[PDB]
């Protein structure tokens, strides 16, 4: 029988946690989503020639759930700590709130650093909003730095909108959890 891996997804609200979960598991692009009233997702994945069942636990990024969120933390095999590459506050929260919170509950559970919304690195309007505050989209290199400093297995990035990087992210998550 197939092994089932617990993957928990954390990060600031609106970085795109739910979107990349839905897009990966359904192959749908955001525009094609059929609104759902339920949470979490289960997908079969092929790693090293063998199938695995991937259990994806979504979480709220808001402070209003700081109390309930860690309930889902026991038994986790791997964490995905997400931030938007076009949201610098997202980035900082990785070091300030996210890895701290997950290392606090799950001392030796692995985690990847996941950068989201990479399609917006090219968006004129986004670029401009960031310039007006003297900022630039986080780059893969500055993200890689953060990853090893904080000691994540690694950094991977994707776009739910174009689906670039999407497959790689969850492959690495399984590799990391093994």
């Amino acid at each position: 029988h197939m092994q089932t891996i617990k993957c928990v997804v954390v990060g600031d609200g609106a970085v795109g946690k739910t979107c990349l979960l839905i897009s990966y598991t359904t192959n749908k692009f955001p525009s094609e989503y059929v609104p759902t009233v339920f949470d979490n997702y289960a997908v079969t994945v092929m790693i090293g020639g063998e199938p695995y069942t991937l259990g994806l636990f979504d979480t709220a990024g808001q402070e209003d759930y700081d109390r309930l969120r860690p309930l889902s933390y026991p038994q986790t095999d791997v964490f995905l700590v997400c931030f938007s590459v076009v949201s610098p506050s997202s980035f900082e929260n990785v070091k300030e709130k996210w890895v701290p919170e997950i290392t606090h509950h799950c001392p030796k559970t692995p985690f990847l650093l996941v950068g989201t919304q990479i399609d917006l690195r090219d968006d004129p309007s986004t670029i401009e909003k960031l310039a007006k505050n003297k900022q630039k989209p986080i780059t893969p290199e500055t993200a890689e730095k953060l990853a090893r400093d904080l000691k994540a297995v690694k950094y991977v990035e994707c776009s739910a909108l174009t689906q670039k990087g999407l497959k790689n992210v969850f492959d690495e998550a399984i590799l990391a959890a093994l």
Partner: protein, 403 residues
Amino acid sequence: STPELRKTWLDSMARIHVKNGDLSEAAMCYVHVTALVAEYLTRKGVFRQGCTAFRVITPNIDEEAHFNEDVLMELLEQCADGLWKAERYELIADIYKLIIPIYEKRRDFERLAHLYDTLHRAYSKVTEVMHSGRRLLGTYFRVAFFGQGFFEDEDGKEYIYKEPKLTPLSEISQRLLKLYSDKFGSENVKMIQDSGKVNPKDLDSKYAYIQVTHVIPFFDEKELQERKTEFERSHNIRRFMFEMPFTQTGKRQGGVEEQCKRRTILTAIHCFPYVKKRIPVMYQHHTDLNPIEVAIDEMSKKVAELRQLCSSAEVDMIKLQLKLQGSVSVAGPLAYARAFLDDPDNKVKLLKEVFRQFVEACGQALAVNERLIKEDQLEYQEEMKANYREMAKELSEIMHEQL
């Protein structure tokens, strides 16, 4: 010589498929060749059956509208091993039944021993993969091309593509892009990353457009009764389906009171598996669902999901918790009850009944789980028990009954 040329093409297709690792398509090429030789030999009075003996392995055999018994026997043995390599074990017996009387008449006991050895291993494999889930026969996609400029005769044509194992939409997408980027040059190929029915009346003739959509095999109730196993629902399949969101008014997504769903069914000209890994779409139709029908639909999927996870003797604890937590610890399902079950259309009897089975299954899963945790949880379980019980209250309220 027509049959020999047919056999020629089929044999070369097969070499291509083997090189590509598309083993079921290679397998179908062998079956097709074997059927052709069988039909010929049957007309000469050399062999007993012909074409239709293989029709149960594939209905595409119809298309097959020097050669001797010995060639036939070798081809049958090739079908058997090809079907083994494709992992379509269930089908090997239909081939071997045709050669068994020949081996018996020839007193070829070692060949008999070998084929029975394969059949034994075949059926052992069948019960194994039926339990473990480790057999992955493929994923399906609607692919549609747009752009006279670069596709020419290929413009406006929709196909069903059959991909390896668990190929994700992105993987077939780039293999397609990269294929026509080498063909046509990078800057000139665009992917229509959306499944809405497009009118060419708003594309730009400067570009080649490829539209890719994940679809799954579709079956009516009768077909679901006839196709009893996961294999039988994965073999000889001609119809596929996807869903898109819409509202009568504006955007595609909206409030549960306005969310509609269009379900499109596509029919290919041939069944899968076939001697090719893509097949033209022959015909299509769709069916629109109302907001409440959408609700019923999604609710019924969840109950069945929770039930099946519980009904398991070999319960998956993590998958149970995933589906269970995403059911009670989220709005949520309540949003349906609120919009559809408080003081319309008297079909409403069904929604209520799904909800009843919903509370029960959630309850059963709560139960199942209480017996699964190692205390490192318990608090988690308790919260879910809390949440669950709380929502039962509101349902019982709105429905003016127990739960």
